[PDB]
């Protein structure tokens, strides 16, 4: 296995982010918006770069 | 019970083979066994303590498992594991200790504590594994009604006994004949004395004998036998048999004559050695009989002749002796010896927690008292209690 | 360090489980571990020796892995393997020895040699496994900070000390009162003597006491306590305290009266035994106090009365004594004992290679000197050095 | 031979790791090994016994394999297994014993019995496995002709010897000078006596020396050396050298002066200690030489002066002594010691079955006789026989 | 000189603020500073000692950055870090000691050791920070 072959854009956040796979992606964008999710969440999702 | 065992070898072979780095495929077979446990446990509640100064700590189970995955182990993996182990350690300790104090006249061979009684339950048996620890090894072989066996360096078979027997005495205690000895642990020292130096004895020879009856049979014993009893080779002032006065013993030592050691089993001579000093083997015996003589020297230089007059006062007391030490032996029953910490562990846990004297063991787990009246109940309880101490020492020393 | 350990259990469980005729699958889990090693190694080069008479040999690695398609090994398989093992053996030996000689005051608990310092490197951690060897087991538990613990037979806790203390003396040394003793290894013998046989003493009783302070706490100790000190039961000519003259000791032995042994910990009595001879347990102590008395016999036969006149000269010197032997015990610190070869291994390697005296250990690794001033630095260095000796003995004896 | 070994570790690791509960996965690697055996055996036929009082027994093989199926183990699984093990146990016992009795001069190293000779056959080699049992470990390394080594507590290197040597004597035996000693097991006690208290000796000092030649080299020895020989500190009446009369020994003990212990190897001093009492290390030696002196006290209180007149009769005999004990050591040759049961096992099996005296071993496997004339043949036979005893003790104690 | 200072407050505020547990954003501003260092270093070789009984030790730099990721710092993260710190500690110690023994008359306020003289170099100034000690 290899990962580049699964690269995906973490639509949100400042440091050009390319997360694991589609599902990984979805989830992020999803939660990002469920307003009742600790400020730490967006943060983590955010800055966490490949 | 056997259950208990596992719990440990599980943790040991665990706190041992699970380190930052090692390759997974070394623990694959292990990891499994582990998890299997957590499962069987989770959903169970326990309670230990309640006696004397022993705290009553309560326990519950609810744990996640372990990724099986990863070629090698990363530090993080360990720490999340060690955290789970430490709860089991601190657990078992409390479990052992709780069953290491209770005694039962009836079935002193069965589980006692609310903690363990629950373990012998069937639903827990799914955890047994790797019974190679010498003690459990023998616990099984016995439960199946078979031939047991242990190993001991300088076993502790002789209850302390230090005394004498005057075969010829008189009020003044100026012309005595008899023996004095010290039986303790794995050693026997015995001296035969004759104040008259066999002056009026047939063939000028005085016969002596010392018999020691073991409370348990010893097999495969390697024994050191030496002439002389150093312990009884010096001047002493001793209390009389009735305690009313004191006598004087002023020994002069001669070589024991016609030494014969017999190791008997049920009255039968199994091994016999005639004047053989050094290392001898006694393969199976429940009794030791030491026979030796004092023979008045037929030829004496002036200095010697002067010590042994034809008439009293007898001022130099002719003495012959023997020393016998059991270096190692095998016994079918547990015993204290000079290397194993079992007796000390059991005695120490009871002392530390101020455990009250019970119906089986003598106060303070006193060895002499225990071995002197080594009843079946004391032995079954001792074995249970020694086996638990050995399970505990695999993790906690 | 732990690294090091593996290297061996690898080889042992190797030179052991790898023989002409065993089914592959009995080593599948093993084989792997092995190879894994070779890999991590190959390429890196090492330097050992470079001190005293120790040779500086250079080791380099260039090896092919092991089998994978086998079903019960063929002789040929072994030999091609054994050839590779022998280079590692001869290696480790040189590695151990090189780190078994260096000492360091500041940080004498860490790796010293260029050889080992390189091993603690991260890129090697990938090897560690099966940490069941009692010593390494305790090495880890200490790095995390927890309850360590070792097992010893006839521990060597008492620095050699053979002396006396005259509580009553005079120039002629014809009416002395005091004690003499021998503390050595795991044994203590002490005698109390009173030339006057307590003729003018209150209640005709002379009190004696002997205190021994251990340099390390011993727990779980199984101890033999016997009345009398045979070592001090015979006539002696001794040097006076000031070395200016010699006195005469002519003992006659009486039973020690009101014997009381106390095992104290930080000034507190943990265990106390009153006149109990035989086997006793001392569960945790850093001090032993033996108190005993000489009581003038209230009733004496003529022969006895003659030894103890109302006026000098006092020609027979009343003596009472005790003998105490620690058969086994547990200590949180490494110690020499009567069974383990660690001290002897370390001392022997240093002697054979003419290793110069260093800043930590006393000349010749002298045990008495070491235990007398058992500083934290000496203990950390001793433990490091003992653990290495134990790793070495798994392969080279 | 190695074959034999396996047979056991197979059973042990079997009667141990196989129980009502555990997961298959923990024994998968094991189960296999086992079956593999049954196969190789089945079809073959054996014969054991036939010598002395040893019963003759024939054995055949025709057994089913093992269910390599289940996820866990059900009680029923065990019992159907244990039944098969018990036949092998009762077998091996008979196999060991049968080869533990036969001796042989020419080739006293290789197998003897019809039972074992058949095992060394090639077709069975398909069974070797896990040789971590200290003894077999060394059995192999010796085949490949390499550096072996065992571990011993209170080894048994000194054949019993208790005697004296009068360097100055006369018919009346009233002014003797010489030494007396006891060499036995791992201990030496030697005393030097001078009835004249060096009154006419140069520098008023009498030199003494005691040399003991070991039959095998001991390495890594931890030794206790103490001043005084308690065994020779009391009054004795001894037989004269020619047995024609008896002399009187009335010792008074002084500290040994200028004590020097040398541990030599092939005439070379390997270790030397000057007046160092307590624990000392002797790293490699085949000889011990103890030199010590009696120095007449230059200053004496009246009581002392009275013991040592300028002219005979000499009534108090000045004596100095030493005690040396080898606590532990390593030897390249098998030896009896204070912990191992090998000698006792071999001696016991031979005694129980009334095995006739053979051409190699002394009657009764007498240790003193054996170690006194420890020929290569006796050692090879002893090692074979000790290794078998150790294989047997893994299952039968 | 000032350079030197940083090296430490870096490590302290490091061996201190970096531990199994802490949430992400409490090291963000820090982490950075750190890496920045490793970079500037790697490639340059050093030398300490050479005087009296001071061992002449050689130092080399070639360490990987960091896994600027994981949320609530996992144990594993630390250990892989601590291993890198310990080389710098044992380093600085040797650096300090080496410059803590040399004296110079004419100009005695300036740096002496081959170790430090090299630090005052411009290419290193990229490190200085938090001068509150
Ligand atoms: Zn012993």
GROMACS .gro file of C-alpha atoms and ligand atoms in nm, chain B residues 153-154, chain C residues 153-154, chain D residues 153, ligand 1:
model
    6
  203UNK     CA    1   1.920  -2.680   5.042
  204UNK     CA    2   1.969  -2.725   5.419
  600UNK     CA    3   2.105  -1.732   5.035
  601UNK     CA    4   2.331  -1.645   5.332
  997UNK     CA    5   2.696  -2.355   4.619
 1375LIG    ZN1    6   2.400  -2.287   5.319
   0.00000   0.00000   0.00000
